[PDB]
Structure formats: structure tokens, C-alpha cells
Amino acid sequence: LLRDWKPENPAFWENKGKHIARRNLWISVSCLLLAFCVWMLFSAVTVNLNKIGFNFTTDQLFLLTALPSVSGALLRVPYSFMVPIFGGRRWTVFSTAILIIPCVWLGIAVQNPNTPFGIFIVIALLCGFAGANFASSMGNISFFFPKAKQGSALGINGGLGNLGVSVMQLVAPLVIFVPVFAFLGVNGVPQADGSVMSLANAAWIWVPLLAIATIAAWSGMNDIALWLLSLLYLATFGSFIGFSAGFAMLAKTQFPDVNILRLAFFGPFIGAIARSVGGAISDKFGGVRVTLINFIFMAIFSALLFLTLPGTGSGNFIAFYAVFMGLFLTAGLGSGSTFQMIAVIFRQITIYRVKMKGQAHKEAVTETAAALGFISAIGAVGGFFIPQAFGMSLNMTGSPVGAMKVFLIFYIVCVLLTWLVY
């Protein structure tokens, strides 16, 4: 617990602040990366479910992937209010450790083929908790920095939490296939290639990780003492997770033959780098300028992607996966850009309007870190919208399309709306 935090006296900073902040940064991402790992597990799990006992409709499966964001976006609200009640140390542990329960429970469900969908829904929701682990970690790493590095720092906390989805999607398809846990009696299905798929392994390698990090949060982590702008973030980040979630599912329903999980990780891994340097690009080379050029690419790829499917064009996958990388890159920058915009928009407002109308560089740095609540809570509604779109289309129709089209009109409408405030 800290008492005398003066981030802003260059000396306090140079000879101290820039040692503790840089430490607490390095723990916050851990407790985040991992949290995103957990949040988006029904990415790869939902795919491989049926290659075991399970036979869930491909509408149920999308839903599974789509369900975390429901509990996640609701929770993203209260989670802002948490650090300020319990602080950076204490909270970052609870909200991290609380995460083992669904993880363990899912390795368990998945090991039991006669286990009904309802249970997965409970689990899916319990995974959405890990999604709210960003309203906090965002509104916490702020008070560790000047307003000078409040930008860069929020960005490195930002774009490495989202590195988490990608890091699991590369890892968790792979550990299914090594008997890491069978010393616990974890069961598996012997595969065609003649190697056991043990799917609990995608849900259990997180456990120890989680624990180590929630123990690191228990050490080196310490404490301290216009609803439209959100609609854009939704557009530019809901696409990141929305496509992170209900994508690999989608590359199954379109190219059932490709071994997707071997390649789906790259999408977010692209889009995570893309969220990041997409604030520095936004500063030292534009800002509002970007978001449009950007949106008018999403729009592009959004439309384009109609071409790469089994029927319309030749069913080309190495086209489908080409384009989705576009869709990540883009959906990536903007989330970092319409986040940074939102931030100084909000810095200005409450620095200016509140202190020039009427300590404002106090009721604003600690207020920006708040208004990040509503924005990201809303901004996570995309990855419910998305996979659930896809699922539903494929249900009542038989294809994407009626999903791909609402997304298309989305970008357009957006590419359009930003012009009106240009």
C-alpha cells in the first residue's frame, strides 16, 4: 500500500515513480493477458467439442463462443468502481483468482460427454467475468503515470491484454495433444493421426498460470489514493473480439476441411499489435483522420469478403483467411485509436470545460479512468452481436451473409457517421 504517490515531480518519477509504475505495469498485463486467455476460450473449445462426445448444433456452438461478452459487458460496469473501492493490489488478485473456477469447471465439463448444454452456458458466463478484468486494469494503470505517459502506458496495458486471446489460440489447440495432465486422470479421445486429443488441457494449463500471476498481483502490485463516442469503439473493437470469438467457428462452417486452430491465432495476434501502435500512429500522424480511412477499409473488407466463399467465388479459403487478417488489422487500430481519441477528448472536456467553467487535472485523470467504463462496457457488446449474428444466420438461413451484410452496413453507416463530424 502506497501513501505518498507523486508521479509527476520529474524527480519523484525519475528516481522512483518510473520504477514502481513500470513494475505494476509488468504485473497488470500478466493478470490481463491471462484474463483474456480465459475470456475467449470458447473460441477453440467450441470448435473441438463435437470431436468428442458432444453433438451440439452449430447454432449452439456460436452461442457458446458469443456468451462471455454478455456477462462481460454487464460486468465491465461495476468493475470500474472496484479498484477505487479495493485498490490495485487487492482487486487485481480477487478478479484474477476468481477466474480459476470457470477454467477448472470447464476442463471438467469437457471431460464428461454426457453433460448438457445448460452447463456450458453457465461456464460461458463464468468466462465472461474475465472480460470485465479490463475496466479495472485500465482504470488502474492510469494512476501510475504522468498524464504524459498515461497515453503510452494505457496503450501497453491495452494491447497486451488483447495479446491474450491470440496467445491462447496458438497455445491451447496445441496442448490438447500432449498428456500434460493425464497424471490426474484427465481423459481423452485417441485421434485419427493416432494422438490423443485431451481437451481439458485447454482449460487447465491456465490454472497454474493464473495462480502464479494472482500470486504476483499479491506481491509487487501496490495501491494509491456524448454516449455516441462509445458507439464508435464498439465498431472498432467489437470487431476485434467479435471476430476473435466466432471466427474459427466460421472457418469451420465454410471450410470444414481446414485445420483452423492451427492458424486462427494469427488473426488476433495481428489485431493486437494493430491495437497498439495504432495510438502512436494516431498521434504523431493524424487521429480522427485515421478512424475514417480505417473504417473505410473495414467497410471494404466487409464487402469484399463476400467473394471468398463456397459458391459465390470459388470456395477459396486462402482467400477467406487472407481477408480476415485484413478485418483484424483494421478492427485493431481503431480500438486503439477510438480509445486514445476518447481519452484526450475526455481529458480536454474535464480539464477545460470543468476548470474553465469553474483540481481539474485531478477530477479528470481519475475521471477519464472512469469514463473508460461506459465506453468499454459498450465496446464489448460486439463479440456478443457478432458470433451470435453468424450463428443465427446459419440457423434460420443456411449461410453467413445475413450476418455479413449487417456488419457491412455497419461499417458503411460508420464510415458515413464520422464524415458528419468531419
Curated annotation (Swiss-Prot):
One of its GO terms (molecular function) is nitrite efflux transmembrane transporter activity. CDD domains: MFS_NRT2_like. Changing residue 134 to E/W: Loss of activity. It comes from the Bacteria. GO terms for cellular component: plasma membrane. The chain crosses the membrane at residues 25-45, 66-86, 91-111, 115-135, 170-190, 196-216, 231-251, 260-280, 290-310, 317-337, 370-390, 401-421. Keywords: Cell inner membrane, Cell membrane, Membrane, Nitrate assimilation, Transmembrane, Transmembrane helix, Transport. Its main location: membrane. It is found in: Cell inner membrane. Changing residue 373 to A/L/V: Loss of activity. Changing residue 238 to A/P/T: Loss of activity. Changing residue 164 to A/S: Loss of activity. Residues 46-65, 112-114, 191-195, 252-259, 311-316, 391-400 are periplasmic. The keyword Membrane applies. The keyword Membrane applies. Induction: Expressed preferentially during the stationary phase in the absence of nitrate. Residues 1-24, 87-90, 136-169, 281-289, 338-369 are cytoplasmic. It is a multi-pass membrane protein. Belongs to the major facilitator superfamily. Nitrate/nitrite porter (TC 2.A.1.8) family. Catalyzes nitrate uptake, nitrite uptake and nitrite export across the cytoplasmic membrane. May function as a nitrate/H(+) and nitrite/H(+) channel. Could confer a selective advantage during severe nutrient starvation or slow growth. PANTHER family: HIGH-AFFINITY NITRATE TRANSPORTER 2.3. This is Nitrate/nitrite transporter NarU. It comes from Escherichia coli (strain K12).
